[PDB]
Amino acid sequence: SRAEYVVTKLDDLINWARRSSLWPMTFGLACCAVEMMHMAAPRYDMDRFGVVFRASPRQADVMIVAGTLTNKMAPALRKVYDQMPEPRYVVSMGSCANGGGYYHYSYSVVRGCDRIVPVDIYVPGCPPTAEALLYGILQLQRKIKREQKLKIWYRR
Amino acid sequence: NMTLNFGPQHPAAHGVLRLVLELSGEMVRKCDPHIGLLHRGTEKLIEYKTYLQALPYFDRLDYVSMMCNEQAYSIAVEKLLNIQPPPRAQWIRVLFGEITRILNHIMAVTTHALDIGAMTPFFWMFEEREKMFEFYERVSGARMHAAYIRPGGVHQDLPLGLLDDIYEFSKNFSLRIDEVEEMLTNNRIWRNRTVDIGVVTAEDALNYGFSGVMLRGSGIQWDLRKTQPYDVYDQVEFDVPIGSRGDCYDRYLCRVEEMRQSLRIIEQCLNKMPPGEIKVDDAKVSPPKRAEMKTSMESLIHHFKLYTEGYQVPPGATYTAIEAPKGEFGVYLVSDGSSRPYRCKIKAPGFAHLAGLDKMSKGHMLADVVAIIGTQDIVFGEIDR
Amino acid sequence: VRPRSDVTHKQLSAFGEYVAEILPKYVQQVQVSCLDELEICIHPDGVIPTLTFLRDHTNAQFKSLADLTAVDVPTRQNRFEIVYNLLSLRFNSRIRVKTYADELTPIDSIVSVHIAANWYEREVWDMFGVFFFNHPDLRRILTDYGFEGHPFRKDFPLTGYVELRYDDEVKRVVAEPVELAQEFRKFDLNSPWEAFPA
Amino acid sequence: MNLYTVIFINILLSLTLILVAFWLPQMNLYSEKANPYECGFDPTSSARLPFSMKFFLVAITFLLFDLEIALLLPLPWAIQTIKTSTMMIMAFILVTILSLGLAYEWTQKGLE
Amino acid sequence: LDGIKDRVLYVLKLYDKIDPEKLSVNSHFMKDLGLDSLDQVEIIMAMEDEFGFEIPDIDAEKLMCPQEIVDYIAD
Amino acid sequence: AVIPHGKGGRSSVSGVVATVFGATGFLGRYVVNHLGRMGSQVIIPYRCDVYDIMHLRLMGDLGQLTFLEWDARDKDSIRKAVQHSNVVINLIGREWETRNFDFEDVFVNIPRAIAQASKEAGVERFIHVSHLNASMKSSSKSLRSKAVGEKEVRSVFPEAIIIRPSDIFGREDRFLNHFANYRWFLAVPLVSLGFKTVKQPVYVADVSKGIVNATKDPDAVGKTFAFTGPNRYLLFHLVKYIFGMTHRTFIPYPLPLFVYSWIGKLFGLSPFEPWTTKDKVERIHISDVMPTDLPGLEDLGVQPTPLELKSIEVLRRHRTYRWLSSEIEETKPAKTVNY
Amino acid sequence: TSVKPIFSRDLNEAKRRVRELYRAWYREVPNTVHLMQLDITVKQGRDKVREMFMKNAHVTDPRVVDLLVIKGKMELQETIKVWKQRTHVMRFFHETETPRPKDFLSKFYMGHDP
Amino acid sequence: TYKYVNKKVDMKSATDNAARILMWTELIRGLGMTLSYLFREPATINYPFEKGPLSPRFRGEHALRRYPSGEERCIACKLCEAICPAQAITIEAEPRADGSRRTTRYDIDMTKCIYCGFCQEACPVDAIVEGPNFEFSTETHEELLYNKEKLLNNGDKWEAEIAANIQADYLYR
């Protein structure tokens, strides 16, 4: 009965629900979508894991920033990000979006999306392998599992 | 005339395209596509890089068609050096050149349908795509963005066994194209949303520089692969799929037909690929074999200089165009005697096609615009460069 | 050794004279490179006339514009070298017509001759700054909406002068002068030894 | 009453769900999260400005065709009319006349 | 006819970067006020909003006199 | 120390390693902003979940911000946070004393232990923050406690800069948003009808820059700067003005503070962050002290910024579909009562 | 010397065009501050247009002035329409960046290379 | 050689057409195809349990190898830095007390890296190799930047497979 226990269990449930269904947004920019689309495709089904693309940002959670965030698109990313629901996580995909990639020193490329949107998991590789994205989405799932929002409420 | 930004993040719009549109009713009065949402500097960056370290940029210019693009720079750098690749390398480039065409068409036809609303063709053919990627990986090391076709031939001979598998796949892929067909070619509904949408006249297609299926679909007969043969596409025999009543449906049929014709070219390449070397023997242009650079002084010196400094192409300028899956992909590579290029304008089949969106989608509904962006196979990497 | 076909070198050379005679007025130099390509060079005023003759002449139909580009030789008084590459589906051939334009001496636009150029001319203005008179709608295509400076000019820094980050205080993306965390290492690569020209 | 009982449970079940939806979640609110969504770049226009539809005529007919449907709704109880023939003639006329109206739309190309 | 001058005087002092009680009908925006070339432009525009008539690009160049502006507005 | 090299923007170095304990909150968001902009090394202790601390990550260069897990009831956590910092800034505060932390803790108890360790560490300067007009005999337990602490902090880290700011307004402000948030209550209950309530508001940014500047300025030692503002106001105009920009009607209703302290008690009762509190109410109806002699924002370099100037940004979210398009200069700015 | 003209034979004619653009921007400032919900004052905004216009006031070259308005006009269009979202416009105001002092002593105290 | 993709009233012909139009036949044909696959074995792999096949040349994640004796292979010739297309590798060196030549700092910025595999190509001693692992996704950006110690540690962990992979593909190179 100790509420503390009662709290942890409850939190876990909350974490299980979120981690289980991570509707990723359809944000595809620099040909890494091709890899992502491969994840969605049959060899490496994203859906099985809960992922199901939902473009209306409003209804989407994870934002996989696949590709180069050019300066012109920078503000847009920020906007879409700001318009997603509250609990939102960003998975940077690609060396072009983790940092600057082959185009880091260019004048039109933001050196990383974590300069425009806070990033939770960075998936490395020029075309980060689809399995690697899947590994990255799975590590976001372990990141969420560890989050303990209500226990901090209780202990606050 | 309601104004509306199709939006960078549009599930349908490939990649990110802000298609500001003025829509009378649902009809689209004006189409002013905006570009550069993916400009990244590819043309300026290349000036600061050596010829071999600018090869990876070409794979990224239009990465659906990863290699075919590399062949265009290769050819261009080979012309400037007046060197030509060894016989086996040529066949390879045509082998992977075609495999790449299929990969692009599976992308273009299936992604077209996903925007239209048919989703099962994409999953059916992305599994076949996947299988092809594996060829890339077992030949280059990377699923896409290989860097296999280098300026003097390919990088490394095919693994011992690939040809056999590029056969099993080819032997079957046809049925997979056939299936898509039983699903879309005659659908009572595919036809409607595609037929008589975005008709482009023959004279207008040449005028706006369409140069691709878009021309071929209007009935103009031009395949740079038959008119101006590059590599050994001359020794193979294939039929260009010309079209009449050019419209979204007709061109589609053309793209399904080149998927078919490319299997005819792949078969041959497997049947007739010669024993030989896969890179020019001029250590001057091609890097020396690693056993040689580790036992012979002239080879180390040539390895050190080639990797650190470069080819040192003779001064000149060339425009070499191939028939990339999208259309004519050309590199105008001006070159001083230096090891790093001076200019490298990439002609993108796509800068011309998008421009045509305005002259194609006139008096058309919002859904029509979605269909036409699909029938141009717009990959914003090539347009934005 | 590439498989040169002299048959071509001659036929294209012969056309080069043909054009040189047909338009004595604007053609300054004509040469068929050893790479089997013709590159008529025209005075900037001959932009409209030389193209039109090639687009609409029975013995030289050059219907589509493959590309419009502008190399920038800073040394050259006329900085830019607008190059137009054209194709003839009829004679299966090509020709490049290249002119010279300085920063503030605009070139005519050929959108009339080929509408393909509507976009490429906007691309040349955005990157190099050459201006094209009589253009329907010249406006930046590739660069950001507020970009200052023409990027592909050889005198423009690669990294550029401005970069973008999100600032919480102002809750909006904000330019700042570029501060790079590892400057582009500028390897010097030219070798002090030349190659005796063949 | 039995229906009233069922229906109020039906509304209650919904209203319960929406409420749960608004009071349960943690909510952080900022302007930039509630400004309209325009597929990225923000609205250029009012998003409520006059919209020029191009299918109104058809829309109007719908209304006329709806009504006809109505006048036809009482047919089940009239199939029982001793005056069966009359009912046939009357009904047949109703459908036919409205059918003609529809066809006219086509003939005059009004709907097209 | 003076009513125009009544309005024209009201507009000149309201912008407040000119006429700090030195407003005069003979006074010229460029000649004595020193108001900039551009500022004048702003002025003519201002007059246009109150008058309800937009004066052309050029005639703005000729009138630097509030009295001459009333002369033209009456026409 | 760290010699300051660079041009002045991100990816440059200023040499200020600074623990900032309450970064998670309203002002912290601003303190970390400038510290990060300047290029300072910022260690942000946090006990909120990692998801909430993410907004902080975007501000500062790769490696500028380090986040450490810390619990107030554990002295060791504070110990390691200040191990390698040379500047410690304390912004720990709350309005609702919570079940396991009462006003003393959040204001006096904790902020002491912190500076205490900071000294042991050898931090150059400590900047405690206590509320302005936090008289040791003020009405609100909070203000009383905050003063109690400033007495203590002076013992542990003598001359640790202390800043007492006036009401702070900025997007996500209480002072400005809370009033706008009384809309639910059709009328607005204000003691003395919102009069007899002179208050001076200070933009969050103003306060911050000052704080940051305090760290990089020598004169600040042993000072009690009080960031106040550019203009005072009777609570009446403030309330209406707010409602003015929000474009929502105003019905200032007199209600005895006696009865109202009870309303605060009611919300205070609520488990989830009471919307309002006994104390907050008193603090609201607590007038602000005079300029006195204490130095000010401009003294620390940041010239105060008038409320009306940025009010439009703070109150915009509260407008309606159309009111969302009105701007401050067509609107009427309220009068300034210095009293 | 001996330079071909673009749109104005002489600075005089060119100045005419500048006047027009100024007017254009002057008339537009208010609209933008409302269609972009920018947090600036129209008076302030017009000041900015003035500043930007003045920043290039030194030029006396007919050809240079003509291009300057071409470019200026293009900027207007973008701003007239919503092509330039607020982030773009506010950048003109350099709101976030910290101003740098130009006093020698100031620079000495801060930067190696002034 | 060209081909016409879409170049192209008896009662029977007309009736059959009507049969299709009113019985929706070509639509029923499409449904049959999807029902058919529903019965095919799906091609997906349990991702954690079963892994998509990668052959020896897969570039994956950077590692620095060491000689069997234990001496790190790199001799700081620094042409891996020269041929890096992205400017990712930063190398500074000084003679180790032994007198030999070694790199004091070797930093591959993986976010800058575009995994071209030229460094694998360029190294004379083949000290820098493209290791098989592709799963190195990291919570923080700093972790992705790799110094000599992480790469050497990466090299030690995957040396057995790296050696097998280089063993399989060296004849080809």
Ligand SMILES: NC(=O)C1=CN([C@@H]2O[C@H](COP(=O)(O)OP(=O)(O)OC[C@H]3O[C@@H](n4cnc5c(N)ncnc54)[C@H](OP(=O)(O)O)[C@@H]3O)[C@@H](O)[C@H]2O)C=CC1
């Ligand atoms: N704007 C105002 O209302 C004024 C504020 N001040 C002072 O300025 C400081 C900052 O103000 P503001 O940011 O608005 O205050 P907040 O309520 O936003 O909290 C400030 C910080 O203190 C932390 N904190 C609060 N309680 C505890 C606790 N029990 N243990 C550990 N950390 C805690 C919070 O972290 P977390 O939430 O994660 O616990 C937060 O990061 C305050 O300390 C206040 O005294 C002075 C005058 C006016």
Ligand code: SF4
């Ligand atoms: S990272 Fe490699 S793949 Fe992903 S976008 Fe940048 S370049 Fe294309």
Ligand code: SF4
């Ligand atoms: S090339 Fe091989 S050896 Fe030379 S530096 Fe890079 S790694 Fe060390």
Ligand code: SF4
């Ligand atoms: S892989 Fe290509 S990019 Fe990454 S380091 Fe080796 S060379 Fe530089």
